[PDB]
């Protein structure tokens, strides 16, 4: 009847009268609630002379402020009742560190949310909740709805342009709506509670020539809202586009901030198939969002007003604030600046400040080769949370976060899915700058911990009689030295069980998978793995060789089929020699393979060369013969057929034993086409030009993985491997420009290194080293400029308007 | 602290670089009148609606006499704008642009 429940929205009463906030609490009966004055939470650590200097009018001494880790040593490990203007209180007669500091400066509305639980069984009402919001529009239909759940009338403003009838009559849409309503009834009875949704919703489209009439209709809808129900009214506004506008239009109304799907299927005469799905999603999502908010608030003790539409990392912020408030140390949360608020500066810049944010990329270990028995292995995911949990087996914040992580892991097992989602998103929050309570030191230290985790995994694999030929920290690639048959694969499973049991970890991915009976490992995108995870019969159920060939794509479109056909021929020959060697035993197999395919290789080489003799200088052929311009390579044309054989050499050069036979084949080829037996021009020197954003993440999938824009396929950058969700272009350009310029300032903040002694420039006034040698340096502008050119090439490849603007700025 | 040097003193020590032209321009400027150099003040925020109304009223005041100089200060946005991997379906850079 009066509060005694959770408040959906918590907002300031007015700009004036600071410290007093309105409460949108919905009581177990009819919403209704309010809050008293809350002091401006700001700790200056000093109280003795605080009173004469300023009227703090609330006492706090003996470590009033909180010292939290950051670059300044001073901040490394008393709230004022009135928002009085600062009057130089930096002077501290307490003999403590000079400066008032702002280690804990938070809005009191946020602070009371931090201080108190959501409930003041979250809310098990039979209450009905209104459901008017902006309906998603495909392109320019301006779809909108003014719907009251008790009103039973959708009363949409959708299809606002009166010229075209975007909105359909929705009678057949209505009957299909209901028949899926019984089809989706299983979630419906759960969604039927807490809001009237089982009722059929009629369709009444309204066309408005002028948008001011639309605003007047919304105003009159608000005049219905809280008068048709009189009291006890809740509104569900999950539309992000109208979330901000309705709050201004609505006065004292209550609405959750969480968002529904941003848009529906892009379909405008045939809007019925997508209108139907959008409205189905709307009615199911009413109850779904209500229940999700209730359970998340029970897990979180936070209001529904807490933002989770982008991510529930704000809930992570409020829970971590609550956890810190329990301890003597006090939170560093700061809504105004998403950067961590440690001490008072919160803005100090030095070499370490850029050091922690930059170079946050997972190092990759690659060993290019061909091996008898290769396994792509488990492919561990979410290694960040696993690593932080295994670390438990500044230091105070580390201990608090480890305790919270162990608590969540306990919640992550055999509990609600919200706990699992929060655990998954904790890693994102640790790295998300938008989410507050984000520390650059925390992100860098988690990155370093993952580095030591990969190192320990490598050491553990080192003990086994197997070699890690590749390391991605997302999938880990190891080949076994022995030539053992199928029974080894079961033995491989047994041994990797024994391996994972030995250390004190339990969070790494099990279920070894994607073993390669033969693998020709060049990089992520050039390989010839065979016979992936199966009943493990060693090529009996041979999976076709998965082979992206980001270099084979580079090739001329006519030479590409020839190169691919010859790599299948090569693969078949090595496979056959592999069964031959295995029968002999009952890379020598590759050595025999070399002599096996030498004759067909050399005969087809010259044949192709002889054809190219007349093939060249043909306008029809040269159109196909031209090497496609790709961001990876900048090598000279050098007779693309010669490029083909050079690539063949490079992919063959992996087998160390056959390298002599590869040299024989190269001598044969340089006899085929005149060239020195050993030559730099004969050398390959393939350029990769990999443009990668460190530790890129997909918000839906929460996976952490470096994204390589040049090397990966055009859809590979767009859509991550884990989940079907595709990365938006804007964040891609933002991150790419982030890395680019961050390197630019790094270039502006480097430290010189001498020539002879090779010391570092500890001297600001050096003018040549005190050593005889001069200051050499590390990484100058020129190849950064060529990287800018690669960025421009990608900009031609991918629209990237933000990237285009960045390039235009950098040219100036 | 190292004593400074007056701009005129610095110029006369370094000689003429780019007197009759300077004095002609000085006379013209003294002839010039009511040239208004208006500076709004630090940290103008385009996000706030109350600040938007205040700035609208300020522009109304400046409409009476267009200043010969107007300065727009840093931090045009209220809160820092930056890359968001956890996008909320609309980039922060897009709000900054808008
Ligand atoms: Zn994803
Ligand atoms: Zn030296």
UniProtKB/Swiss-Prot annotation, chain A:
> What are the start-end ranges of the zinc fingers (CysA-type)?
698-723
Q: Which domain of life is it from?
A: Eukaryota
Q: Where in the cell is it found?
A: Nucleus
Which residues does the record give as Zn(2+) binding sites?
698, 701, 720, 723
- Residues involved in [4Fe-4S] cluster binding: 754, 757, 769, 771
What this protein is reported to do is described as: Catalytic component of the DNA polymerase epsilon complex which participates in chromosomal DNA replication. Required during synthesis of the leading DNA strands at the replication fork, binds at/or near replication origins and moves along DNA with the replication fork. Has 3'-5' proofreading exonuclease activity that corrects errors arising during DNA replication.
What does the record say about domains?
The DNA polymerase activity domain resides in the N-terminal half of the protein, while the C-terminus is necessary for complexing subunits B and C. The CysA-type zinc finger is required for PCNA-binding.
Q: How does it assemble?
A: DNA polymerase epsilon is a heterotetramer consisting of POL2, DPB2, DPB3 and DPB4.
What does the further note read? In eukaryotes there are five DNA polymerases: alpha, beta, gamma, delta, and epsilon which are responsible for different reactions of DNA synthesis.
Q: What is this protein called?
A: DNA polymerase epsilon catalytic subunit A
UniProtKB/Swiss-Prot annotation, chain B:
Additional remark text: Present with 3110 +/- 251 molecules/cell in log phase SD medium.
Q: Please report the PTM annotation for this entry.
A: Phosphorylated in a cell cycle dependent manner during late G1 phase. Phosphorylation may facilitate the interaction with POL2 or the activity of DNA polymerase II. Phosphorylation is independent of DNA replication but dependent upon CDC28 in vivo.
- What job does this protein perform? As accessory component of the DNA polymerase epsilon complex participates in chromosomal DNA replication. It is required during synthesis of the leading and lagging DNA strands at the replication fork and binds at/or near replication origins and moves along DNA with the replication fork. It has 3'-5' proofreading exonuclease activity that correct errors arising during DNA replication. It is also involved in DNA synthesis during DNA repair.
For this chain, the family text in UniProt reads: Belongs to the DNA polymerase epsilon subunit B family.
Q: State what protein this is by name.
A: DNA polymerase epsilon subunit B
- Entire protein: which part is shown? 346 to 460 of 689
Record note on quaternary structure: DNA polymerase epsilon is a heterotetramer consisting of POL2, DPB2, DPB3 and DPB4.
Query: Can you say where in the cell this protein is located?
Result: Cytoplasm; Nucleus
